[PDB]
Every structure is written in C-alpha cells, then in structure tokens.
Curated annotation (Swiss-Prot), chains A, B:
Name of the protein: Volume-regulated anion channel subunit LRRC8A
Catalytic reactions on record: chloride(in) = chloride(out); iodide(out) = iodide(in); taurine(out) = taurine(in); L-aspartate(out) = L-aspartate(in)
Known function: Essential component of the volume-regulated anion channel (VRAC, also named VSOAC channel), an anion channel required to maintain a constant cell volume in response to extracellular or intracellular osmotic changes. The VRAC channel conducts iodide better than chloride and can also conduct organic osmolytes like taurine. Mediates efflux of amino acids, such as aspartate and glutamate, in response to osmotic stress.
SMART domains hit by this protein: LRR_SD22 (SM00365), LRR_TYP (SM00369)
The organism of origin for this protein: Mus musculus (Mouse)
Keyword Acetylation on entry: yes
Site (Required for anion selectivity): 66
Tissue expression pattern: Ubiquitously expressed. High levels detected in the bone marrow; lower levels found in peripheral blood cells. Highly expressed in pancreatic beta cells.
UniProt PTM: N-glycosylated.
Compartments, record wording: Cell membrane; Lysosome membrane
Quaternary structure, from the entry: Heterohexamer; oligomerizes with other LRRC8 proteins (LRRC8B, LRRC8C, LRRC8D and/or LRRC8E) to form a heterohexamer. Can form homohexamers in vitro, but these have lower conductance than heterohexamers. In vivo, the subunit composition may depend primarily on expression levels, and heterooligomeric channels containing various proportions of the different LRRC8 proteins may coexist. Interact with GRB2. Interacts with NOX4; this interaction prevents the ubiquitin-mediated degradation of LRRC8A.
Keywords associated with the record: Acetylation, Cell membrane, Differentiation, Disulfide bond, Glycoprotein, Ion channel, Ion transport, Leucine-rich repeat, Lysosome, Membrane, Phosphoprotein, Repeat, Spermatogenesis, Transmembrane, Transmembrane helix, Transport
Transmembrane regions: 9-33, 87-105, 175-196, 227-251
Glycosylated position list: 52
Length: 718, 718
C-alpha cells in the first residue's frame, strides 16, 4: 500500500481538484437531467427575428395548447440553445476523466508499473534495513543472518540499478503525461472561457415550426442558466488551479535535468564521497522520493556506495570467520611453530588478531589489505608472509612490527606492489624477496634501503639477478645465510663477496654461474655452500678451499662434473657432502680420508663401484646411492657401526651381504629398483627395526620366516 | 493486485474501456427510464404520411385534450420510435457484459484459473527468492531454512513445468477469447454504425389512430435523441478503440508463434547453457510475463537450468556439513584407519575433500554423484567404498585415482550402476565385488576387463557365481587373497584353481562345496583356508594338505562334519584351527600332533570330553569350548602356561579345578551359564585379570573369598 511515496504534493493537489471537478460535474449533470426545461413564449410582433417589445391591463392569448408549448420548448432546447449550456456537465466529466487517466496512466501502464513497484520494494527494503541504521549511527555484535541479508540487499540494489538505469521510460512517460495535461488545460481554458458567455437566461429561437404552432419566433427562458454560469465559472477557476499546478510540475521537471541525480548532501555529510551519480530512470524516481522526503533517499544511498559495501564485506568476514574456526585452522610450519594461512580472502578478520598464540601470519592474494593496529594484540607473532598482498599499515601497527617482527616473506610481480615500509623494520632478521627487482635501467634502486636493516641475518633474493647489487654486497658484511635463486639466469660476482667476513651459508641455486666464483675462497667463515643447477663443468678449485677450515656442508648437487678432483682429500673437515645428480664415473680413494662425514650423498650418478676405503668412515650416518650401477659393496663398508640411513635406489644388486646383520645403529634402509631375490634372515635381529625403516618388495619380504615377522608386527603399533 | 502481472497494457486498457462502457450503459438506462417521452403535435396538412410544414400570428387550434396528446405520444413512442433509440443502453450493457466475460473467462474457468494462480505464485517466489540473487551474482553459505525453501521452490518449478508443458489450454483459451472479442467488435461496429443514423430529434409517425384523435400523422420530437446520439457516438469510439486493441492482441498472438519460448538471452548472458526452451502452455505465459516485465522471466530462468540445482545441493551440503561437524563423524574401521561413511546424502559434500587425514571414503546410497577433481586434494585416500552408488568421474580426478587409489569396494543391484572407469585404475591393489555378476546368460563380460589391473592382489567376488570365471583364473596368476562368498550357490571348480599358485588365502564362504575341492591341493603357497558354510560332510582331504608347507589357519567352521580325520598328524604348521558350529563328539589324539596351535577353537559342537594330551600342545593361547557337553576340565588342560583366553560357556561344568591360578598369561575367561556351585579360591592368583576378563553370573561370583574379589575390583581402577 506504499504508493503514496511516488505522489508529490502537486499530484495530491491535482487529485483533490479532480475530485472537486467530478463533484461539480455530477451536480451539474443531475441538475441538467432532472430539470433542464426551457420556458418559451411566442412573439406576436417580430422584428429582425426577435420580440419587438411593442380599461385595465389584460393578458394576451396565444391560443396554444400545453402540448404545443411543450413542443416549442423541446424544439428550442434542441436547436437554439447553445451546446455548451446543454453539455457543460458532460464535458466537465469527460475532461476530469481524461485528467485522472493522464495522472494514473504510468501507475496503470505495466511497463512503468513494474519498474515503479520494483523501485518501491527496493527502497522499502533499504529503508527498514538494520544495516542502514548502523551505517548512519556509525558517525556490540551482529547477527550472522543480518549480514547475509545485507549482502543480498546490496546485490539486489546492484541488479536493480543495472536493470533500471538503462530504460528511461518512467521519466519519458511522466513528462509526456504532464505535457498532455498542460496542453489539455490550455485548450479547455481557451474554449471554456470563449463559450462561457453563451449561457444566457433569455434566448430567442426562430425554429421554423408554423404548421404546428402558428408562430415564427419565440422568446425563451433558461431558468438554470445562472446556476450553470456560476458552475462554469467555478470549473474555470478549478481548471486554472489545475493548469498552474501542471505548469509548476513541468517547470520542475524541465529545469534540473532530472535524468541525473546529485547525491551531494550525503557526500558532504556522511564523508563517503564515493557515491556515484545516478543515471536516467533512476534519478527521476529518486527525485520524486526526495519530493516526498529526503529521508528515504538518504537511507537508500548507503547501498550505492562501495565504501559501505567494503565495510559490509569486512563485517561479514569477521562474523563468518569466528575465532574458534581460525584457532582450529592453526597449523605448524617447517620451523614447528603455530601458522595461519590466509589465501584469497577478502581481508584479515579481526578475530585473527585475537590469536595471541600465533607466531607466523601468512597472507596470500588478499586484495587491498590494511594491517590494523589490533596486530599489537598479537605478541608471539614473529614472521609475516605477504604473497601478492600490498599491505598498508598504520603508525602503531608499524611501530609494533618495527619492534616485534623477525622475518618478512614477500612475493611480487612489480616493484610498485611491495610495501614501502619494509625498511622500517629495524628488528627484521630474515628477508625473503621472490619477485623481480630488475627495474628499468637501475642498479636495483628498489632495495636501496636494505642498508637500513642492521639486524638482517638471512637474505633470500629470487629475482633472476644479472649483476649482484652493490647494496647487497655492502649489507652482507653482517649476513649469516645468503641464498640466491635466479632460475638459471646468468649472475656475475666480480669480487663482490670479499667484503663479507662472517657469512656462513652461500646458497646460489640456479644462478647460472657456470663456474665456481673466485671470491668464495676468501669467505673462510663459510660453513654451508650450495650451487644447485649452476651449469658447472669443473670443481678442481678445491685446492683453494683449504682456506675454509670450518666448511662442513659443501653442497654441489644438481650439476655436471666429470670426476671428483683429488683435492677433496686435502680437506679433512668435510662433514656433509652433496654432489647428487652429477655424472661422475669413479670416486677417487682420497675422498675417503675425511673421517667425519655424516651426510654424504652421491646419488643419480654414473658410478660403478665404491672403493673399500669407505669402510674407514665410522662417522657416516646417511648415504644415498640412488640411480647407481653398484654391483656390490665392500665388506669393509659394513664394518662401521654408527650408520643411520642407506638409500639404494635402482642399483644392480644380486645379493645382500651377510655381515649387515651386525648393524645395530642403522635406522632405515631403502632398496627400491634393485633386482634383489635374497634377503638375509639375520637382518631382522636388530635392536631398532620396524616396517617404516625397512621397506622392501612384498614377494621379497616372504624370504624371511614368519616367527620374526609376527614378533616385529606385534611391536609396530607403539 | 495479484494477477496484474498477467494483464498486459491491452488487457488493462480493455478493462478500463469496459468500465466506461458500463458507465455509459447505466447513464443511458437511467436517462431513458427517468424520462424518454415523445412530444407529438398532429399534422393538419399531410402529404405522403408527412406534413409539408405549409393581423398578427395566432396559435393553431387542434381541439385535443391533454390525454389525447399523452395517448398519441405513447402510441408513437411505442410504434414509430426506432428500436435502437429505445434499446441502445440495454444493448450497450449486454455488449460490455459480454466483453467483460470474455476478458475474465480464463480467470474464472477453474482448469485455467488453477494453472494461472500457480504460475503467478511460483513466479513471485522465484522473483524474490534469496537464492535467485546469488545465482544472478554468480552469473557458499545460506540459512538452512532458506536452503530448504530454495530446494522446495526448485521442486515446485520442475513439477509445474512437467504439469503445464503438455496442456495447451491457456493459449487456446486466450486466443479464443481474443477471437470472440474481435468478431463481437466487428458486428457491433457494423450494426451500431448502420443504426446510429436512426436516432433523430424529429420523427414522423403515422400510427393510424383517427377514431381516437381525428388526425392521421403526427410530427413528434424526441428531446433525448441528440443526447442518445452523442452517447452512441462515444460508445462507437470506445468500441473502435477496443477492437483495435483486440486486433493488436490477436496479431501479437500470430507474429512470433508463442507456443515456443526462445530463452536464449538469459542462458547466454548468465552462461547457463543448459536452460531448456519452453514448449506450449508454458511459453505463452512466459511471453505474457515478458509483456509485463522480462525481469520475472529472468528470475524464473535460474530455477530451470538444473545446474543451479546442483549448485544449491552443494551449498546445502557445505552449510550442513562443516569441517568441525565432519571431523567428529570420522571413525576407525577394523583396519584401524580413518573412515568416512556417508549415508543417504543428497550428494558428496564439498568439504569432505578438505580432510587431508582421510583414508577410507565410503559412499552409501547417494544419488548420481560425480566425484569432482577436488578429490585430488586428498592425500591419504586409499579406499573408496561405493555402496549402491554409480559414480561418474572427470579427467583429472580419474587420473588422480589411477595414481593414488588402493582399495575399491562396490555393492550394486545391476551391472549398469558399477563404474565404467574401474579398469582405468591401474594401481588398484584390492577389489571387492558384492553385487550380481550373473548377467543375462553371458560369460561374465561385465568383469571381462579385470585383467587390466596389473597390481590386483585381493578379490572378494560375492555375486552368486555359478562357476569360477575364466577371467578370474587368468588374473589369479599374481593374486594373493581370493575370497568367494557364493551365498549358498553351488560352485564348481573342475580344474580352475591349480592355475593360481601364489594365493595365500582361499576363503570360500557359503560356496556349497560339500567337499574339499581336489584342485586346492596344487596351491602350495596357501596360508589360510576358509570353508565356512560349505556343508562339508567328509574332510578326509586333509590327507593331501601336508604338501602345503605354509598352511597355518585351516578354518572349517560352520559345517556338518562328524569325525576329525586321523590324518591331522600329517599337518604340522597349524597356527589357528577353527571347527565351530559342527557335529563332532571325539577330538582325536592325533590332533595334538600339531604343536604350533595358538587359536584352537571348538565351540558349538557336540563334544563329550577334552582329551588329556592337550598338555602336549604347550603353545596354546586361545581355546573356546563354549556350548559343549564338557563334563569337567581335565587337569592336563592347565599344564599349558601361555594360554591367554579361555571360553567355557553353556557347558555342564559342575566343578572347576583349584589350580586355575597356574596360568599367569590368562586374560579373559568366561564361565557364564555353567552348572557351577563354587569357585576356586586360587582364582585370584592371576597377575593380569580384570572384571571384564571374568564373565560369570553374580550369584556364584560372590562365593569366593572377599579378598580376591576386592583385589579384582582394585585391578579395575585403570
């Protein structure tokens, strides 16, 4: 029943004027039906078709019957009474009906009635929406269903806007009906004022009935002429008022260009300037509603602003992502600490910052993320991961990160989408850049602020470096673990690492060095070196590595070196050795001089056999011989008692030695790809042996008798 | 206010035109009834039944009474006044009532009225449905009641489409109404225009009343003739407008073949390619709505795609089964691995593929579920149970199953509902068929592709197999466990088992063998033999089982065997012997020649005594003698020390030896139902025995000294 909102004051006034005109039409019509008599007396002395007006006085006899008088009255009413004086009430009724039809045509026309009812429904939904009350009172919890209803209302408003704004039918129809009203008012006022003077009390009729009455002309009287005259004057005044109102409406809708709305008061008041102007067929109904009252328009405008939409998105994210759900979603990363991963979420829920036990926060593909000051509520947070997220941070939150942030992992595609406050983290320890720092003709000016971080210990640039940045070389004087990945992109050192004196890890995975750098020799403090996929050819530079007396984890796997140089034996501190996925045809015996090897692995190699000198390495813990043509192993090798893991992947073994049964400290064994058919039964006599440690083929597993298999299976639970 | 959607602009125009016609008819009728007098003056000089109209003037004397004038007026009104003048208002009333009836017939006709009101209700529900906005925004989460309402609306839409699509009653009725309106307008215009000229103010009557008045012809006057002519002209104009409108409606019904609805705009805009084109009696109503507002048709389209139905099902499942409410439903099966069992669900919830820890996914009576590629998100998934479920698979998910699937259980009522992608699982270890492989008298073509599974190890055919298939014999070359549950159907081998020589189990439950097969003698690698419910009468074939050097768990329970053969002494390596549910009175002394027995079990058997040579079998761990005529336990029974479980129930045991305490490894002992009057006082000397370990009636449980009872209760604390 909410049709009155679309009727402005002028429509109400025109409706009331139409009601009054209809009342006077009914009054005049019932008078002209019940009593419309003309009283006609004949003229005996006639000049120019009119009465000539020329004992005691006596009446003049006309010798006319009553029915002759009635016939004369009827004929002079029909012929010589002005049509206006006869049909004034009927013309008034017709004009009032046409006025009402023009007024209500757009309400009754289905094409515009559908749009009007849709607009009224949407406006009333936006009017009684509690989220509108909250938005206007923004200047304490919300129901889960209310947020979903508000989101559905926002979507409904967007669909209504995209369906209605392209029509431009309601405005055109309203303009057309107002113009019809104005032109009809003009025509009716013209003809009514012209013909109102033809309603006279006394008329003269010369109706040419002489064979019936014997008289030529008659002097008539219309006793209802003065009443119809005042009725016509009253109707003329009413039509004048109606036309003035219609002219005001036409001026109102032809001066402000109602096809476009302003939405300026709310933007100047609600501080939400991001409310776009409204196009045609939707600005018009907004203008009409404003003519009713601006309250509905202001309450409706909150569904046209994207700021309110984003606020609703954030509130629904907070309400749906409850604290318990995030707490249950907490996981443990590689470093064995609490981890929370946010992937493709619209934002960071405020319940997340209630997880004071959180230590690492991962953000991936979160759009327009702003880190609120509530991060200070977190205290155990130490690492922040920004995966394709441009984070904007307030002053207190940035101070908290400047005081309580250890590591920062960011991935990016452009230098512009990295945080500009990264260099403000004075307590940062680990920095992991995995983007593209190579900008347009600059020596990596984007990271020129890396000198600010004096607490930096780990740097993991991955941007396909061509020339090592001078800022990185300068900042490496206090760096512990420098890891670089170029994905095979050429990188040149050219006496760059000689400035560092305290570096210990020098991962250069996929840096396309193609040669071992000559500057790595001066880094005596180094302990881990890894050169994976550097397309190296020769590693005969070990003779220069004797300077590194603390080196224990020389890693060179995923490379191509023809043979192991003899200079390996010169170094005796080798504790971890790695040259997997290389093409080395034989292992020199001098390599086995190192008595402290523990994690030696030479897998995926063209090896034929291992020399017996390997058995003097009692300290060996893990060995990988995957993809090697090892026909057999020396019995001296298994004389060791401190072995932990031996991986034998795809090796040509026909038998397994019977002296391996003396191995007790062994933890796990892998025999995948071997063409074995015999397994010693003495292998099962071991203090530590389970299914997980030793995995073999099921058919080969049957070569041992069941009395030990059942016993070990009994203890496999715990 | 409810059916206004079904009224286009022409229908409302015709309704208002008919209202104005009703007003004209009422006004004319009341005008004629109130006064329709004739005023007739006689002609003194007549020529061809019409007068020629041939000091001062004087009136013409007729010498007629007033009643003579009234009589001639009445006679000329009744006789010589045209019937159209007298009956115009009543004809107009009849015509407008006929037009109204034609307009409102299909609204008052129940056969069409029910369809129209149901269509309006359904369209209104689809217009403001909370899920239509979501479907259009997609181009999740929702309240459970709202989801139920959306599903009910989907079902209502589909049933309405089924009901109305084959009616063709609304379109025909509407076309017939339009045709009747057009022909009525044609005849009305014809006759009304032909007879409107017949209403005139001046009318001559020669009514032949001369003996009563003296005059032959009379010149009459009809004072209402001009007003009636104006009303008739207005009615003619209204009928012309009505006829033009109805002709436009008729042409609109013949310009597009409204029996078919394109529906292409929405199905191509919203990418719902499978939106069907609507046929007769349902395309016409959609065209009517499009005449009112196409937005209702757009909203109604999203309840017709049947892809939106799938999305609604998935959303309801996701809202119903949250991860917190789904992990609590995880269970551990017999194999002590995580199991998820879905029962009578509308589909596979999208949150079941977020359970990384899942190992067994059991699907039971879920209708037409297509396993999504998100199943690859499962990492520990190894078993897939499809119970009475036909599952369709896509390219990525089928490849993932071909890579990471171990077990497959399927129960089916017809062959067609088994997956056709089962043979695409080349990594499957065990397969379980529990349906009816006995197809329409074929050589088991339904399983002819079993040979493709190169890593098959376990077979579980329970399909009333009348004979062992050739495909099974071929594929058994590398089969470990074979289990056939024929459910009492006779099974014949006839040289069909000796091909398989690597089988370790040969379970043959309910195979109705009636005899131990002669082909089992060649399976030298067997370890377990199960012949449950085979109706074995003679088991003399034990004389041929000494060949099998790994036979340990010969099971012959649930059979009808009288005498245990003396040839048990040939067997040596039995670990578990089961002879339950048979008819055996004598336990042979040679039975205990198999000294490796651990789970010997002879319960529900007509035994008489327990032989004294049981002490010679020192490695016994379990012995259930439940439901036997065991008069008393021999003292040699307790000569064993490692016995763990001892079930002596429903036996006639009058006394129990006092040396029960000799067994320290006995954990569970049952004596319920026996004829025991006292218990040994040494029963409490058991290091490992709890309240659950002793199953006796409470009346004789208290006869033992209170100290041992209280010690037993003390052992029950934890």
């Amino acid at each position: 029943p909410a049709y009155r909102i679309l009727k402005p004051w002028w429509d109400v006034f025109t409706d009331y004027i139409s009601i009054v005109m209809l009342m006077i039409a009914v009054f005049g019509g019932t008078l002209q039906v019940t009593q419309d008599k003309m009283i006609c007396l004949p003229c005996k002395w006639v000049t120019k078709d009119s009465c000539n007006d020329s004992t005691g006085p006596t009446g003049i006899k006309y010798d006319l019957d009553r029915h002759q008088y009635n016939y004369v009255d009827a004929v002079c009413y029909e012929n010589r009474l002005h049509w206006f004086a006869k049909y004034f009430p009927y013309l008034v009724l017709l004009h009032t009906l046409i006025f009402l039809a023009c007024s209500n045509f757009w309400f009754k026309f289905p094409r515009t009635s559908s749009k009007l009812e849709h607009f009224v429904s949407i406006l009333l939904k936006c009017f009684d929406s509690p989220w509108t009350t909250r938005a206007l009172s923004e200047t304490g919890v919300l129901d889960k269903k209310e947020g979903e209803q508000a989101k559905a209302l926002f979507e409904k408003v967007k669909k209504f806007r995209t369906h209605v704004e392209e029509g431009d039918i309601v405005y055109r129809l309203y303009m057309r009906q107002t113009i019809i009203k104005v032109i009809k008012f003009a025509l009716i006022i013209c003809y009514t004022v012209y013909y109102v003077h033809n309603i006279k009390f006394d008329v003269d009729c010369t109706v040419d009935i002489e064979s019936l009455t014997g008289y030529r002309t008659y002097r008539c009287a219309h006793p209802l002429a003065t009443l119809f005259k005042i009725l016509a004057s009253f109707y003329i005044s009413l039509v004048i008022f109606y036309g003035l109102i219609c002219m005001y409406t036409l001026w109102w809708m032809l001066r402000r260009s109602l096809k476009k709305y302003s939405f300026e008061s709310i933007r100047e008041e609600s501080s939400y300037s991001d409310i776009p102007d409204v196009k045609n067929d939707f600005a018009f109904m907004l203008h009409l509603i404003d003519q009713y009252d601006p309250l509905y328009s202001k309450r409706f405008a909150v569904f046209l602003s994207e700021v309110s939409e984003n606020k609703l998105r954030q509130l629904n994210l907070n309400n749906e992502w409850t604290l318990d759900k995030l707490r249950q979603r907490l996981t443990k990363n590689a470093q064995d600490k609490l981890e929370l991963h946010l992937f493709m979420l619209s934002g960071i829920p405020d319940t997340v910052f209630d997880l004071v036990e959180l230590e690492v926060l991962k953000l991936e593909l979160i759009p327009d993320v702003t880190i609120p000051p509530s991060i200070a509520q977190l205290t155990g947070l130490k690492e922040l991961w920004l995966y394709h997220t441009a984070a904007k941070i307030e002053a207190p939150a940035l101070a908290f990160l400047r005081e309580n942030l250890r590591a920062l992992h960011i991935k990016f595609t452009d230098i512009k989408e990295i945080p500009l406050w990264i260099y403000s983290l004075k307590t940062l320890e680990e920095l992991h850049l995995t983007g593209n720092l190579s900008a347009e003709n600059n020596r990596y000016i984007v990271i020129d602020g890396l000198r600010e971080l004096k607490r930096l210990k780990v740097l993991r640039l991955k941007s396909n470096l061509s020339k090592l940045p001078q800022v990185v070389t300068d900042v490496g004087v206090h760096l512990q673990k420098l890891s670089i990945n170029n994905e095979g992109t050429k990188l040149i050192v050219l006496n760059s690492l000689k400035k560092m004196v305290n570096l210990t890890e020098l991962e250069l995975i996929r840096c396309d060095l193609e040669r071992i750098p000559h500057s790595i020799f001066s880094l005596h403090n180094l302990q881990e070196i890894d050169l994976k996929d550097n397309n190296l050819k020769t590693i005969e530079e070990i003779i220069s590595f004797q300077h590194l007396h603390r080196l224990t984890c020389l890693k060179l796997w995923y490379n191509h070196i023809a043979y192991i140089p003899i200079q390996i034996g010169n170094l005796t501190n080798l504790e971890r050795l790695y040259l997997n996925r290389n093409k080395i045809e034989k292992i020199p015996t001098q390599l086995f001089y190192c008595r402290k090897l523990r994690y030696l692995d030479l897998s995926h190699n063209n090896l034929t056999f291992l020399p017996a000198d390997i058995g003097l390495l009692q300290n060996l813990q893990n060995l990988a011989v995957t993809a090697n043509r090892i026909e057999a192993l020396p019995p001296e090798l298994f004389q060791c008692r401190k072995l932990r893991a031996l991986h034998l992947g795809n090796n040509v073994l026909q038998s397994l030695p019977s002296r391996v049964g003396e191995l007790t400290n062994l933890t796990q064994i892998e025999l995948r790809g071997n063409r074995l058919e015999c397994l010693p039964v003495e292998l099962g006599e071991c203090p530590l042996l389970k299914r997980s440690g030793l995995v073999v083929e099921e058919d080969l597993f049957s070569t041992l008798p069941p009395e030990v298999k059942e016993r070990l299976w009994r203890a496999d639970k715990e």
